[PDB]
């Protein structure tokens, strides 16, 4: 299985964004649309809200925070890769080399009923993100020495399957994310099903191939109660990954 040090050195953030999030009718854009609709449902319709949301394994992406910034005063973004956090920071600071998220932002504005336009939505997200932190989900203290208040919600999109080499580590990671959550707080996970790798160009990265039953069992083992669980059949392009759909779940910490 891919060593975690490979993420520091070989995960190219700009290449990842170009391959998966350009949003130019690709499998990658169909998956992105589905993820955005579910995140809108959770944070805007279901009213998952609070003072603090921690996004775990954010990579260099912000799409997973666009609806969340309407419901949370503060968002903390985290990743194992320092290069990924620097790419995020380019967008947060509105630096010239920042990735163009405007088609994704417009799509979320449309989903939300065109209450606001792209620039207002972006400013709301930029104001919500106060901290950009290193994290390691495999550790009992994922945020290391950095203290944070217990969060109202922990979100993790397409991270846990890449971070966990086996099922015991995956259950342990759910427990470690739980240490960041307030009692009764929400856990929101979205990831690929039955995927054993993903590609960024010629660079291969391992993935833990879990089925829906093993994911649900691990969340219950780790001390959560599931509110809803959805499986989609849509898979990534054959050149990208070997998954059999994706899942999304919302649970509460016991
Ligand atoms: C496939 S990307 C998902 C990125 C983003 N959340 C998205 O939805 O596109 C996997 C992310 O997991 C991060 N990662 C890998 N191992 C990790 C670990 N042990 N702890 C935290 N993050 C880790 C990588 O650095 C990378 O940003
Ligand atoms: C967009 O990122 C991905 C694309 C496809 C598959 C995976 C995976 O199996 C684990 C982590 O990330 C993935």
Measured in angstroms, how far is the CA atom of residue 174 from the centroid of ligand 2? 18
Is-contact 90 116, C-beta < 8 A?
no
Question: Burial, 111: exposed, middle or buried (Cβ in 10 Å; 0-12, 13-18, 19+)?
Answer: middle
Helix orientation angle between 82-92 and 13-20, rounded to the nearest 10 degrees: 70
Contact in structure between 227 and 47 (CB atoms under 8 Å): no
Q: Tell me which residue has its CA closest to atom 15 in ligand 1.
A: 163
Residues at CB less than 6 angstroms from ligand 2: 20, 158, 161-162, 192, 195, 198, 207, 236, 240-241, 243
- The experimental resolution of this structure, in angstroms, equals 1.4
Rounded-to-integer distance, Cα 141 and Cα 6, Å: 21
> What are the DSSP calls for 54-103, one per residue?
EESS-TT--GGGTTGGGTEEEEEEEES-HHHHHHHHHHHTT-TT----HH
For ligand 1, atom 18, the nearest C-alpha belongs to 136
Give the Cα separation of 48 and 177 in Å (integer). Answer: 17
- What domains appear along the chain, each with residue ranges and CATH number? 5-253 (3.40.50.150)
Contacts 24+ apart (CB under 8 A), 213-222: 214/167, 215/189, 215/191, 215/247, 215/249, 216/249, 218/167, 218/170, 218/171, 218/174, 219/174, 219/187, 219/189, 219/249, 219/251, 221/171, 221/174, 222/171, 222/174, 222/175, 222/178
CA 196 – CA 161 distance, rounded (Å): 9
- Ligand 1 within 6 A of CB of 136: yes
- Numbered residues of the known binding site: 16, 21, 57, 63, 79, 84, 136-137, 157, 191, 207
Distance of alpha carbon 81 from the chain centroid: 14
């Amino acid at each position: 299985f891919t060593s975690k040090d490979t993420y520091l050195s070989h995960f190219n953030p700009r290449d990842y964004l170009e391959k998966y999030y350009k949003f130019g009718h690709s499998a990658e854009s169909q998956i992105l649309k589905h993820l955005l609709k579910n995140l809108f449902k959770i944070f805007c319709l279901d009213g998952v809200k609070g003072d603090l949301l921690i996004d775990i394994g954010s990579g260099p992406t912000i799409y997973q925070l666009l609806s969340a910034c309407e419901s949370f005063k503060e968002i903390v973004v985290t990743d194992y890769s320092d290069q990924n956090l620097q790419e995020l920071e380019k967008w947060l600071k509105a630096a010239p080399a920042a990735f163009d998220w405007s088609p994704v932002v417009t799509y979320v504005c449309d989903l939300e009923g065109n209450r606001v336009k792209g620039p207002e939505k972006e400013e709301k997200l930029r104001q919500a993100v106060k901290q950009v932190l290193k994290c390691d989900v495999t550790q009992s203290q994922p945020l290391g020495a950095v203290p944070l208040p217990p969060a109202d919600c922990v979100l993790s999109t397409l991270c846990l399957d890449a971070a966990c080499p086996d099922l015991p580590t995956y259950c342990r990671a759910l427990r470690n994310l739980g240490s960041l959550l307030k009692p009764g707080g929400f856990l929101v996970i979205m990831d690929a099903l039955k995927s054993s790798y993903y590609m960024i160009g010629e660079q291969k990265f391992s993935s833990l191939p879990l089925g829906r039953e093993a994911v649900e069992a691990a969340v219950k083992e780790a001390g959560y109660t599931i509110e809803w669980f959805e499986v989609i059949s849509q898979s990534y392009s054959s050149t990208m990954a070997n998954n059999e759909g994706l899942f999304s779940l919302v649970a509460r910490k016991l």
